[PDB]
Amino acid sequence: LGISIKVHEPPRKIERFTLLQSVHIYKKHRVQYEMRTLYRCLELEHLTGSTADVYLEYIQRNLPEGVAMEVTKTQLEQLPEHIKEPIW
Amino acid sequence: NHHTYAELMQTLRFLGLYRDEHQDFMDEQKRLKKLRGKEKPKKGEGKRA
Amino acid sequence: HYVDWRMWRDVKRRKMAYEYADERLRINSLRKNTILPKILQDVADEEIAALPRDSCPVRIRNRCVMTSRPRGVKRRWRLSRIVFRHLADHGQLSGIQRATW
Amino acid sequence: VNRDTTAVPYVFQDDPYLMPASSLESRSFLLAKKSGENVAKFIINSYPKYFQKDIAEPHIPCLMPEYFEPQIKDISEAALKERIELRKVKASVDMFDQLLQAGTTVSLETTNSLLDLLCYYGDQEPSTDYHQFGVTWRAKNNAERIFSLMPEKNEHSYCTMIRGMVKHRAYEQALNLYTELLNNRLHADVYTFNALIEATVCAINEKFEEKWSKILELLRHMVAQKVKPNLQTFNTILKCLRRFHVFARSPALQVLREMKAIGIEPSLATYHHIIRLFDQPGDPLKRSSFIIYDIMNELMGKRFSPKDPDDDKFFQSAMSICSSLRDLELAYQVHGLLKTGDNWKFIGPDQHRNFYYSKFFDLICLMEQIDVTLKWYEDLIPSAYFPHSQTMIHLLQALDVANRLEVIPKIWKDSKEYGHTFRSDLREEILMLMARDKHPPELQVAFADCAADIKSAYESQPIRQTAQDWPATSLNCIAILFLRAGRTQEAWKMLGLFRKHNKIPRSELLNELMDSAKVSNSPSQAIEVVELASAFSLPICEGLTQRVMSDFAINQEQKEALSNL
Amino acid sequence: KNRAARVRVSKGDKPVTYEEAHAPHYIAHRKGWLSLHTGNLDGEDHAAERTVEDVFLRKFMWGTFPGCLADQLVLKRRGNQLEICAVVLRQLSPHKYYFLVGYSETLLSYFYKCPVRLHLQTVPSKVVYKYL
Amino acid sequence: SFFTKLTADELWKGALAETGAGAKKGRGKRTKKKKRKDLNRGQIIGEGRYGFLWPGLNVPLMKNGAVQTIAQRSKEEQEKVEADMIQQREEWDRKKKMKVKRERGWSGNSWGGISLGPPDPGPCGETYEDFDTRILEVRNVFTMTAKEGRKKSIRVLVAVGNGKGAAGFSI
Amino acid sequence: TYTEDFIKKQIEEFNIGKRHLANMMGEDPETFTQEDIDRAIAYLFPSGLFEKRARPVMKHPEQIFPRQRAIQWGEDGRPFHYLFYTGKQSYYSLMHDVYGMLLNLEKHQVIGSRWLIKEELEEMLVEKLSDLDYMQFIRLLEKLLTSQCGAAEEEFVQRFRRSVTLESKKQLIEPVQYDEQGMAFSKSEGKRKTAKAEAIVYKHGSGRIKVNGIDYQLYFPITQDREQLMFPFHFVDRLGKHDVTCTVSGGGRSAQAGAIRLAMAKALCSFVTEDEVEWMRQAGLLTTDPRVRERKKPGQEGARRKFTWKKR
Amino acid sequence: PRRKALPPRTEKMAVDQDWPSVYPVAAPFKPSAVPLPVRMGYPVKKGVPMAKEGNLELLKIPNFLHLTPVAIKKHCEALKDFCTEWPAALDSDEKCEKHFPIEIDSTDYVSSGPSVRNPRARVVVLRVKLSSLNLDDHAKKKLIKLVGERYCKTTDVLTIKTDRCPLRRQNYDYAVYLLTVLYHESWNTEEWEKSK
RNA sequence: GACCUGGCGGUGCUUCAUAUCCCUCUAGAGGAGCCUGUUCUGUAAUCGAUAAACCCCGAUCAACCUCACCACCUCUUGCUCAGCCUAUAUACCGCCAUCUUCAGCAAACCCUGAUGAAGGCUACAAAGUAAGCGCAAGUACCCACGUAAAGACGUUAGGUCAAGGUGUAGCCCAUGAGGUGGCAAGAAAUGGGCUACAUUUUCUACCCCAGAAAACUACGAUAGCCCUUAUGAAACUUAAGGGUCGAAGGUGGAUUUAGC
RNA sequence: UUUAAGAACGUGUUUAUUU
Ligand SMILES: [K+]
Ligand SMILES: [K+]
Ligand SMILES: [K+]
Ligand SMILES: [Mg+2]
Ligand SMILES: [Mg+2]
Ligand SMILES: [Mg+2]
Ligand SMILES: [Mg+2]
Ligand SMILES: [Mg+2]
Ligand SMILES: [Mg+2]
Ligand SMILES: [Mg+2]
Ligand SMILES: [Mg+2]
Ligand SMILES: [Mg+2]
Ligand SMILES: [Mg+2]
Ligand SMILES: [Mg+2]
Ligand SMILES: [Mg+2]
Ligand SMILES: [Mg+2]
Ligand SMILES: [Mg+2]
Ligand SMILES: [Mg+2]
Ligand SMILES: [Mg+2]
Ligand SMILES: [Mg+2]
Ligand SMILES: [Mg+2]
Ligand SMILES: [Mg+2]
Ligand SMILES: [Mg+2]
């Protein structure tokens, strides 16, 4: 599609927690679990509203099972009219 | 809402669309206790009075 | 068709606490301040204490939604340690595995 | 993407055990899946409370229970309107009397909405999940009762009543009701005039010359009341004229030319009613040929939109014309028009789809080269339609014409995969072709490996009602294909089945049995050939026996042979 | 001794499947997960509701396809969709499978307010990994 | 609730108590043993108490060339199906209770003199259909082990013969 | 059991499936090696299972199915080998050949190489072997070498020897770089516990060290920490000859010094002789210290300590 | 007799076919459709991995058969008609901040489930350097005292983060409004300012 | 009477134990105060664990709720096509403890013992071949190390019917359901832990080049008492902080825990 | 050849095509 893209791998996060092994007593004996969350950031640059609307829809639909996404959009704006000159 | 889950699957079993292996189990036991005489008594007219 | 009566009593408590949540909120605001007169704050102390007991949120208990167990419950899944492990040990909880390090 | 030739329609489960093999399964598999959707909707609308909880965001209205019961239990003008939107014929009419009996003023826009509900369904309840011949309209019905109760009647009152009569084959009564309309200084609409054209012809079975004059009167009245015709108005004319195949031919074109005059684009249904009319069971078909060629040039390179309910029936008919004309260059235009844009959606239901691809493919095998006929057989089947026993036959008669009999062992495999494993006519034409002439060893050994599979089908048959029967030609061909191949051992075991089922063996099967015995030099086997034919009293046997006696025969056996006759 | 999700050894006449033959300490080494969603990821939400839906689905399908399931289900979530993938036997007639596919896909769509699709893979007999 | 319901294999495994501490060292009387019963044996898919007829599942899809519609059996006709299901149940059950009169040997509960049939056929096309096997002694012998303790083992003595001078015994 | 006909049908499915997989990915079926198959199977069927023997695999049937011995007797029933009834015709036919070559010698008269291991000898013979059987065969081979073996014998003995890749415990020198001014220096990295340090050692200097932009004696008040910084340079007699500029992050007081000590030593290896670098290695100045904090266990007070035990 | 299953359609497939037509969209692994002798599973002693037929491990995988390179290149060729060209003028980032001095950040979250809502989507961040604004000595000195820790002197950037209102369009308006009242009050001079 | 197998021996010889048996190292427990559990006693007033393998154990947790206890009162087809935390863990599933800081269990065959219970090895080899499970191998964490995890068959009718389910037995105007209020204390003994008895210390600054303190105003309570705040509808009661107070205690008996 | 070193309630643990 003619888009600039850079890829880097942020550090993973591992959340652990422990639970009792038995239904009754036997405190000393426990079981530990973990959920591993792995990341992958795709930094695009110099897009337009329409190009991003297409690329995002294309990859969001083909987002596999067990994979979430956080899309941060950095828009370019111009100074409002009221900001150009002071009224006082 | 356990009412919905339990009422839905109770209706689906009477309709013939869901087979509850657990009710069938306790329905067979409750049928063998009638032949053995261990039947639930009538309310109010119980052993005590 | 809930697990037990202990569960059923908590369902009612969570329902009555959802109806009076706003009424209790508005009255407590009067009590939690040093601005309004003491005479007015004393009347709000009696109005919120005359509301039904089950409307108080501290009387709610986070039980397991499958077994009605009051203790040993994980808040993220709303399950007891015994039911959570039964599903995790059979590979039915996405991403959950045993830890080794 | 494009259609996957190796697959069946998406709607089916992509699994070998669940894939529809035959065309009956294809239709019975979707009717069972549609029956489960109805069993679930029945349960969803009978116990709404279980499915009321909505957790979706954004809200999905199409996934919530429907409420078919009236909620306003009071008797008022707004309580009847709610029973007309739910199409409650019995409740609305029984409640309309109560509202009328009370004396409350009923608006004319509300009483007109009740007639539409009654004039359409004919004072009968719509079809629900769970609770042809003759004239549906009845004299003892509420439609006519309420019509008299009304104190005031506008144009719409009669317009909706005339259309309800024609719909239920009350043509004779509709015309009588139209006379009253003209007596009240009123004017009908386009739709009412459209139904009036159907009643004219259907009322009486008169000659065309009289009907044509009758129809022209309604048209002159349509222009005399400032009423403009629509596409449907012209379609009814053509649909009605179908009965008079020969005479209506020229009048039909005049109707078509008229449609073009008023700038009304003929839809697919318009052209459908024309080809059916011109088409007639005749041998020459000179006129039919010229018509279709002109229509295609007009339709070529166009995209169609739904205008008439019968637009779908165009393609099925056009193909039938090409098949009757045996013109393949025209079928490529009819089918090439079905692929442009989204015109593939007009092909119609399954039964119409199977018929289209049968006449089409049956005309391909007959006319075009075999190398191209096999590319159409890989694309259409099974992705498009499931073939019928006849199509397999016509395809077999094309391989013969092209001397490509090496594919026969493959056409039999596909036949079993399409449900033709136990088709008598099919198995009786595959064997004859393989055994018609001698072929090289490599090709002669393949036909036997296929003749052994055709033989097993005769042994195991699904229908056990009647005793297993082996056609005479079959047994004649299964045995001769073992000899030529080299399976002599199995060739002698079929001999008992000939007399067992009283099936006559051909002389060519007996004449070739000689070499098999001669190569073996086992006089015993040679006598068995003689013994069999003697039972049937075949003349060739007696003359044959002498030659066998000259070539190879034991002295003791020679004497016994003559006495057995 | 440990007991969770372990099939005890026997004389050698007991057949087991791949998933049924591996214990919990293989769930990310030699097995995968039978359900795949985003609830249990860092910063995600609604992991408790996704679990109750899973528990109900495995029971709805066990009693709706009685004696037909060859192995455990595989639930998949891609956005709004919910894909149920099952391995079933070939005893039942295909006519009855198509009925239950349309009955379950529809009933579950109105219950959970999501498009639901069911994918069957028939096997002649229950696959056997080894004999314990 | 619906979430506190297990499967049949879990319900029977616990009720039978086949694997327990009582079963290991003769701590349980065999006079009243609990017997497993399959409750899905005589159940049809689509049959319920209300008597609904689902086309494609409970009844044929098409009838007289036309697809059927949803129908429900009548009270009188549905009651005849419940009573008929019982007869099939009791009959099936009765067969199991019925005990065959096995030919006793030297005594009713003894094993001696009882026949075991012909030996099993050998792999290399060997058969012993002409031979007859008969038990002579069945003894229960024990040996003490360090972990379990008393380890019960069976000692059997049999004889085989063809009736024509060929005979032999083994343990 | 897997017959020869079965394997022959698996060879045909792999060849056909190898042409499909190349049509999917858009490659040339001809020049499609096994390395490209493994890369395409990991994209189409992504599995993150820690065990690589449990991931999807599409290999050649000759590498998946275990090698099996051919049939040893024909239709008549006579075996093909004269040592068949031993049960180890392959192992004993080898011992018979070797012992026959030791008789001929009597009549007419290692660094990289390692003796074949047991598990690798079973594959060659397609026979199951005991440990004591492996030792007996190895004793004959060694006895064969001692004797004046002929050329043909050496080739035989080399079928049961496997080369060894001898690693080199020689430190890797860093490339000397040049700055804008033209001064030569070398950069390295160290790691101690959670501390991580990057050190820049200039070829010529007046013995100045700056840690995070601060002179070393101010950054490390404790004498012990400064002793560590002195150890690399004192060992090679280069005190007051180089200028160091390092940046350490993380860890604690003493872990940052050890991390810097290691980086300075690694970067100081470019301005010294090879013999000195070896001495630094034998003194423990170039080795990363693997001793890191051990984890606490459940049911215990610490990594190794236990709760107080009560007998009664 | 019993109904028998048809042979898998992988045999009818050709090698030089169009795979995207077979797996156009995301779908589970169908061994009767994928013409690969792929195996999966941990092998037993002297055994081989389990075959694809009946394998549950291959059904657990989120495959990428519908996203082969051939399809991707063919999909994007049809998606170039929806795209727009980026201004050639705005080559670097220094030139982007000269004509567009304001940067709006907003995050969208994609998660499985029936509800798409997320409260983290309402947040809006607005960054702008004070060198791009028409400020004088006094205004700039006063503006830095009102925003407090929202201004970074090291970068000379004013950061405004709004998460008060439910919707994201409202917080965008709120942020612009905040930048406006700050700019004008900064210019305004009051009497108390004299007592500095 | 004579044997088989196992167990046991204050039974022999030999080789060993690696934080483990002795000797040998380091810090603790047992003494004081406090926190906390348990046992007894007490109360109208839960239950369960309770040699090793119970004792900050079910509880990653009790002011009401939780809660199953006591008193009083109230309801009867009852949130449930009812219900019961009623009895039975010596009927069970399920999840575990323990030997295990082990390496053996064993189907199917063969042979020996005159065809007995049983047994089955010697490598310069004498009847053993062995699927499978476990160990091992692999995998996780920072490796090849180490730590985790794993750890069969069985042993203690070991623990749990009060996670849930459940066989058998029992209650059905009550052994069920709901409401209000209330008990959860200490003569006494004991387990574990916290803080101290000080100068390698105490306070302040700093976060390692300092100044003061240092025995009846020292060191030393997280205790008591009083006040305030936080949470909550509700706090002498729970927590935090402040004030006041300045106790025992001067390194601890027989004995005893952990650590490469 | 080499200090002393007691005691442990009673039962219960194995078969059968539109038209
Ligand atoms: K002490
Ligand atoms: K103490
Ligand atoms: K203590
Ligand atoms: Mg609480
Ligand atoms: Mg353990
Ligand atoms: Mg008797
Ligand atoms: Mg410590
Ligand atoms: Mg207690
Ligand atoms: Mg007790
Ligand atoms: Mg107990
Ligand atoms: Mg309480
Ligand atoms: Mg209370
Ligand atoms: Mg009770
Ligand atoms: Mg027990
Ligand atoms: Mg461990
Ligand atoms: Mg291991
Ligand atoms: Mg006990
Ligand atoms: Mg403790
Ligand atoms: Mg104090
Ligand atoms: Mg307060
Ligand atoms: Mg003091
Ligand atoms: Mg005594
Ligand atoms: Mg005793």
- How far apart are alpha carbons D536 and D502 in whole angstroms? 9
Please name the helix (run of DSSP H) or strand (run of DSSP E) that holds residue H125, with its range, or none. Answer: strand H124-129
Domain borders along chain C are 1-91
Q: Which of residues 49-68 of D touch B (CB under 8 A)?
A: 49-50, 53
Burial class (CB in 10 A: 0-12, 13-18, 19+), D4: buried
Query: Looking at the DSSP assignment, which residues form a beta bridge with residue F133?
Result: F160
- Asked if E62 and F7 touch (Cβ cutoff 8 Å), the reply is yes
| Unique residue bearing structure tokens 């024609």 | D166
Enter the DSSP assignment of H42: P
Report how far apart, in Å, the C-alpha atoms of G273 and of each of G183, G200, G236, G268, G277 are: 20, 19, 10, 10, 6
| Residue D209 phi, psi (nearest 5) | -55, -40
Strands lying side by side in the sheet with A30-37:
A13-20, A30-37, C96-98
Size of interface B-C (CB pairs under 8 A): 8
Check CB contact of A36 with chain G, cutoff 8 Å. Answer: no
Residue C22 contacts residue C55 (beta carbons within 8 Å): no
How big is chain E by its Cα radius of gyration, in Å?
17
Helix (H, G, I), strand (E, B) or coil at D491: helix
Task: Give the contacts of G245 (CB within 8 A, at least 6 positions apart).
Answer: G199, G200, G202, G209, G210
Helical residues (DSSP H) of D368-469, grouped into ranges: 370-379, 389-401, 408-417, 424-435, 441-459
HEC sequence for D329-377: HHHHHHHHHHHCCCHHHHCCCHHHHHHHHHHHHHHHHHHCCHHHHHHHH
Alpha carbon distance H85, H80 (integer Å):
10
**Residues on chain A touching E41 (C-beta within 8 angstroms):** 35, 37, 66, 68
Spatial strand order in the sheet of F132-144: F132-144, F150-161, F167-170
The answer to whether the CB of G290 falls within 8 A of the CB of G258 is no
CA dist F135 and F115 (Å) reads: 6
Nearest chain G residue (CA) to A30: G298
User: H12: which 2 tokens?
Assistant: 């009818």
H48 vs G20: CB contact, 8 Å cut-off? Answer: no
F12 touches strand J (CB under 7 A): no
**Longest Cα separation, chain B:** 44
Question: What H or E segment, with its residue span, contains residue C73?
Answer: strand C73-74
Rounded to whole angstroms, the Cα distance separating D273 from D76 reads 49
Chains C and E: how many Cβ contacts under 8 Å? 63
Chain G neighbours (≥3 Cβ pairs under 8 A) are A, E, H
What's the Cα-to-Cα distance from D272 to each of D256, D261, D317, D350, G252, rounded to whole Å? 12, 20, 7, 19, 91
Q: How far is G15 from chain H (nearest CA, A)?
A: 10
- CA-wise closest residue to H33 among E23, E132, D14: D14
**In D437-512, beta strands by DSSP E:** none
d(CA D411, CA D253): 46
Name, in order, each residue with C-beta under 8 angstroms of G32's C-beta and a sequence gap of 6 or more. Answer: G18, G21, G22
Q: Using the beta-carbon criterion (under 8 Å), do D53 and B4 form an inter-chain contact?
A: yes
CB contact under 8 A, E107 and D43: yes
Resolution of this model in Å is 2.6
Tokens coding D353: 């789809």
Give the nucleotide at minimum CA-to-C1' distance from D359. Answer: J17
For residues E122 and E98, give the distance between their C-alpha atoms in angstroms, rounded to a whole number.
13
User: What are the φ and ψ backbone dihedral angles of G162, each rounded to 5 degrees?
Assistant: -125, 135
Strands A41-45 and A4-8: antiparallel
Amino acid at D72: I
Q: Do B19 and E103 touch (CB under 8 A)?
A: no
What is the C-alpha separation between E71 and H54, in angstroms, rounded? 9
Query: Cβ contact (<8 Å) for E63 and B21?
Result: yes
**Which ranges of G114-215 does DSSP label H, i.e. alpha helix?**
118-125, 131-146, 151-157
- DSSP H/E element including D317: helix D314-325
Experimental technique behind these coordinates: cryo-EM
Protein residue closest via CA to C1' of I8: F146
Closest nucleotide to F27, Cα to C1': J13
Q: Phi/psi at E88 (nearest 5 deg)?
A: -120, 170
For residue D58, cis peptide bond before it (omega within 30 degrees of 0): yes
Contact H70 G25 (CB under 8 A): yes
Residues G83 and G93: beta-carbon distance below 8 Å? yes
F→B interface, C-beta within 8 Å: 1-3, 5-8, 11-12, 37, 39-40, 43, 45-50, 52, 54, 57-58
Q: CA H41, CA H32: separation in Å to the nearest integer?
A: 19
Whether C30 and chain A come into contact, CB under 8 Å, resolves to no
Helix (H, G, I), strand (E, B) or coil at H134: coil
Q: Tell me how many degrees the CA angle D118-D122-D124 measures, rounded to the nearest 5.
A: 90
Query: What is the CA(F72)–ligand 3 centre distance, in A?
Result: 77
CB contact under 8 A, C1 and F3: no
F3 to chain C: closest CA residue: C66
- Check C3 against F4: CB less than 8 A apart: yes
User: Burial of E28 by CB count in 10 Å (0-12 exposed, 13-18 middle, 19+ buried)?
Assistant: buried
AA letter at E119: H
Q: What is the DSSP letter of H31?
A: T
Residue E10 CA to residue H182 CA, distance in Å, equals: 79
DSSP string covering chain F = -GGG---HHHHHHHHH--SSSTTTTT-S-SSS------TTTT--TT--SS-EE-BTTTB-SEETTEE---EE--HHHHHHHHHHHHHHHHHHHHHHH--------SSSS--TT-B--SPPPBTTTB--TT-EEEEEEEEEEEEE-SSS-EEEEEEEEEEEE-SSS-EEEE-
Contacts of E31 in chain G (CB under 8 A): 49
Calpha distance D525→D503 (Å, rounded): 21
Contacts of residue C100, defined as CB under 8 A and 6 or more positions apart, other chains included, come to: A32, E25
Cβ-based neighbours of A50, under 8 Å, separated by 6 or more: H82, H83, H84
CA distance G211 to G226: 12
Residues just before a chain gap in chain D (C–N exceeding 2.5 Å) are 131
Q: In this structure, are residues A37 and A67 in contact, taking their beta carbons and an 8 Å threshold? A: no
Q: Where are the alpha helices (DSSP H) in G236-299?
A: 253-268, 274-282
Q: Which residues of F touch B17 (CB under 8 A)?
A: 46, 48, 54
Closest nt to residue F145, judged CA to C1': I6
CA of G220 to C1' of I146 (A): 32
Residues paired with G130 in a beta bridge: none
Q: From B15, which residue of chain D is nearest by alpha-carbon distance? A: D43
Could you give the 3-state DSSP secondary structure of residue A30? Answer: strand
**CA Rg, chain A, in Å?**
24
**CB neighbours (10 Å) of residue A75?**
14
Torsional sign, CA D280, D283, D287, D291 = positive
Chain mean position to CA G168? 12
Q: Are G98 and G141 in contact (CB under 8 A)?
A: yes
Tokens of D209: 């010359």
Distance (Å) of CA G208 to CA F73, G187, G212, G239, G259: 101, 16, 13, 10, 18
Establish if F5 touches chain E: CB-CB under 8 angstroms: yes
Cα separation of F100 and F83, whole Å? 29
**Which residues of B fall within a CB distance of 8 Å from F40?**
19, 21, 24
Cβ-in-10-Å burial (0-12, 13-18, 19+) of G75 comes to: exposed
Neighbouring residues of B43: CB distance < 8 A, sequence distance ≥ 6: none
Residue burial G100-119, b: 16+ Cβ < 10 Å; e: rest: ebeeeeeeeeeeeeebbeee
DSSP for chain E, written as a single string:
---TT-----SS--EE-TGGGS-GGGTTTT---SEE-STTSTT---HHHHHHHHHHHHHHHHHHSTTTB-S--EEEEETTEEEEEEEEESSS-HHHHHHHHHHHHHHHHHHHTS-EEEEEEEESS---SEE-
Q: For residue F145, say whether its CB is under 7 Å from any atom of strand J.
A: no
User: Residues near C9 by Cβ (< 8 Å), separated by ≥ 6?
Assistant: none
CA of G306 to the centre of ligand 7 (A): 10
Residue H146, sorted as left (phi over 0), alpha (psi -120 to 50) or beta, turns out to be alpha
Cα-based angle E75, E78, E80 (whole degrees, multiple of 5): 105
Burial of E99 (C-beta count, 10 Å sphere; 0-12/13-18/19+): buried
